[PDB]
Design a protein around this ligand. Structure first.
Ligand code: HEM
Length: 110
């Protein structure tokens, strides 16, 4: 099976390296990037992200619900376009299928 946990770890590395201020919205605010794997708040967030990816692939993802929750954190379309680029880089680095179509589903509600 595709190692989505490894893809997601690479995704967060890319995302927070390009946009370090995004990290301030999370329970692992301030934690060095090379330390995220040892952080409990990060472990939970990464696990939910992997779960979302598996739900999107499996056909049960609630993209409108995820979009609404991100609006609830003042996260919008621009941030998601940035995330889409970071996730594409992560997928490619692992020889994983691109998830652009899934992210476009969320973007359609942003
Ligand atoms: C590839 C695009 C993204 C995916 C798949 C994704 C996925 C998720 C998931 C699955 C959750 C948990 C939702 C829940 O518990 O109901 C979440 C929460 C969150 N996301 Fe994202 N996200 C994306 C992009 C972003 C971006 C660009 C930001 C910018 C800061 C962001 C900020 C947040 C925040 C602040 C939370 C709440 C974390 C908490 O409860 O402490 N997300 N995201």
């Amino acid at each position: 099976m595709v190692n989505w946990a490894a893809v997601v770890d690479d995704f967060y590395q890319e995302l927070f390296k390009a946009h370090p201020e995004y990290q301030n919205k999370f329970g692992f605010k301030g934690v060095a990037l090379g330390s995220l794997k040892g952080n409990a708040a990060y472990k939970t967030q990464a696990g939910k992200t992997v779960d979302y990816i598996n739900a999107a692939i499996g056909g049960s993802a609630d993209a409108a619900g995820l979009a609404s929750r991100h609006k609830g954190r003042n996260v919008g379309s621009a941030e998601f376009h940035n995330a889409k680029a970071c996730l594409a880089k992560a997928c490619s680095a692992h020889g994983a299928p691109d998830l652009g179509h899934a992210i476009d589903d969320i973007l359609s509600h942003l």
